[PDB]
């Protein structure tokens, strides 16, 4: 399953100019575009090699879409402050995520279009891409405006087709790096803690895509509750890193195994110290 996803953030700052607008776009876990209204020269910028070749006409068109979206987001921020009867001095945040999912066969499996206000769910296109789910009474104002305006049908028209067409084109242009899976490079380290406890840490480095499962077992039984897991983190070269730790009784290290599951592995890995 592949996907193309867009992430928009608008932040007000009363007394210090107009709201700032930031957009980024991903294919799977690979970023390919960014826009920042506060940039020195605000324009759509490439973040991936398979869009560097698209031509100035394409990049002029993406730049214009972001500049128009930024101005609409400013209006939305002003409307939202009114809905909630909020002071004109406070700074507020509007976020939007939308995109499409190209199911394993290569069709259009799923689309989505969701908004949050000040870090909380506000309004969202439901899975059928026809109805809306509003979080409160202020979001019901937006739902009434968009249903009478037939907003959902326009977004569906994009998520179906247009979103899918760009996605398929991007996967063909960047096939060398988007349709590959790099397996994790693994190892286990050992740290004494006390005169009777020690930490075992299972490492996964350089893998892609970001999805992965690391689980510590004892005598073959999983131990989800006593396993410390860090959030998967970017290495900076397009790949990801993760680790998982468990504190074990000294003398019993050989009873523990780390199990690694990832798309690039033919079989799940079993590691021991």
């Amino acid at each position: 399953s592949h996907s193309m996803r867009y992430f928009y953030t608008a932040v007000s700052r009363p007394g210090r100019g107009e709201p700032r607008f930031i957009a980024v776009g991903y294919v799977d876990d690979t970023q390919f575009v960014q826009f920042d209204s506060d940039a020195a020269s605000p324009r759509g910028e490439p973040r991936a090699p398979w869009v560097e070749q698209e031509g100035p006409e394409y990049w002029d068109r993406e730049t214009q879409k972001y500049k128009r979206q930024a101005q609409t987001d400013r209006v939305s921020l002003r409307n939202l402050r009114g809905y909630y009867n909020q002071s004109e001095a406070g700074s507020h945040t509007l976020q939007r995520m939308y995109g499409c999912d190209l199911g394993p066969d290569g069709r259009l499996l799923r689309g989505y279009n969701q908004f949050a206000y000040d870090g909380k769910d506000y309004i969202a296109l439901n899975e059928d891409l026809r109805s809306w789910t509003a979080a409160d009474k202020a979001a019901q104002i937006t739902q009434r405006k968009w249903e009478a305006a037939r907003e959902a049908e326009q977004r569906r028209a994009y998520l179906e087709g247009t979103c899918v067409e760009w996605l398929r084109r991007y996967l063909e242009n960047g096939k060398k790096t988007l349709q590959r899976a790099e397996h994790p490079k693994t190892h286990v380290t050992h740290h004494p803690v006390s005169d009777h406890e020690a930490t075992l840490r299972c490492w996964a480095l350089g893998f892609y895509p970001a999805e992965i499962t690391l689980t510590w077992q004892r005598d073959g039984e999983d131990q989800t509750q006593d396993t410390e897991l860090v959030e998967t983190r970017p290495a900076g070269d397009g790949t990801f890193q993760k680790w998982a730790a468990v504190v074990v009784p000294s003398g019993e290290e050989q009873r523990y195994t780390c199990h690694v599951q990832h798309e690039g592995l033919p079989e799940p890995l079993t590691l021991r110290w």
Partner: peptide, 10 residues
């Protein structure tokens, strides 16, 4: 290819 602005602001 990003989506164009819709029918209305929020």
């Amino acid at each position: 290819g990003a989506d164009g602005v819709g029918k209305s602001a929020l």
